[PDB]
Amino acid sequence: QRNAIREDLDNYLNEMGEVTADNIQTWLSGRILLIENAAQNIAINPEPAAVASLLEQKALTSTFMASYLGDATGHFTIRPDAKMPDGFDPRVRPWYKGAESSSTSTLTEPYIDAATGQTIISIATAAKKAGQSVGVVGGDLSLQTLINTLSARGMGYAFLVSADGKILVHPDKALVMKSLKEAYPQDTPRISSDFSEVTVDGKTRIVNFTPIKGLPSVNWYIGLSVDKDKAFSM
Numbered sequence: 537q538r539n540a541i542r543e544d545l546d547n548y549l550n551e552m553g554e555v556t557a558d559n560i561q562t563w564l565s566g567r568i569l570l571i572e573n574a575a576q577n578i579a580i581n582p583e584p585a586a587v588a589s590l591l592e593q594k595a596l597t598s599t600f601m602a603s604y605l606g607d608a609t610g611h612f613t614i615r616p617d618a619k620m621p622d623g624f625d626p627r628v629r630p631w632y633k634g635a636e637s638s639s640t641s642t643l644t645e646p647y648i649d650a651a652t653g654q655t656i657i658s659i660a661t662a663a664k665k666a667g668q669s670v671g672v673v674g675g676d677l678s679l680q681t682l683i684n685t686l687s688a689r690g691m692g693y694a695f696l697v698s699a700d701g702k703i704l705v706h707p708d709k710a711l712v713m714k715s716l717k718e719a720y721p722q723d724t725p726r727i728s729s730d731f732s733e734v735t736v737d738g739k740t741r742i743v744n745f746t747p748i749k750g751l752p753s754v755n756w757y758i759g760l761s762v763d764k765d766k767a768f769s770m
């Protein structure tokens with residue numbers, strides 16, 4: 537009976553994957569624009585009084601945990617202000633290196649925030665004034681915000697996985713920054729497969745992967761994992 541509507545279930549799961557990727561792409565896109573705008577505006581006049589005033593504005597401080605500018609001399613400005621660890625250097629941080637490596641904006645993987653000590657991600661971009669970089673701007677979003685975004689939509693759940701197979705954001709915090717192989721050792725889903733049927737705790741799940749279109753610099757996927765019996769029962 538299943539083998540007759542199995543192509544049907546594929547169609548629903550692909551649809552659910554697409555919708556989820558679309559939403560995330562949309563939620564991130566406005567935040568990417570604010571950081572880009574901040575960087576465009578800094579490049580206007582990169583005097584440090586100006587920078588501070590821009591990063592203090594409510595549109596940025598209500599949207600990000602903090603935003604900041606770092607330069608090639610090692611200096612930085614962060615708003616809201618925070619006590620940084622001794623010897624903190626913005627140049628070595630994943631937002632800075634990421635932004636300098638790309639011709640456009642970028643998004644980090646999860647990393648440990650120097651300010652709060654919590655796992656976050658960052659949107660970052662180089663502020664270019666007339667072709668020349670003047671530093672890197674970024675904004676921090678917490679993993680909990682990202683987890684909350686994903687879990688909005690009883691078959692299953694969504695998670696965010698990079699195109700290298702590293703889980704970035706998953707409702708089970710234990711699996712954050714684990715590869716697929718490490719998180720699903722017994723029976724590993726493969727991105728190369730439209731659908732991967734895997735056993736988790738003696739139950740079959742169906743896992744697909746949907747690319748998130750329209751992100752700058754990164755190729756990430758939405759993963760969907762659904763209980764096979766619940767999915768078919770539907």
Ligand SMILES: CC[C@H](C)[C@H](N)C(=O)O
Pocket residue numbers: 604612613614626629630648649650651658676
């Ligand atoms: C000023 C940079 C901030 C603190 C960034 N979240 C970092 O951890 O590097």
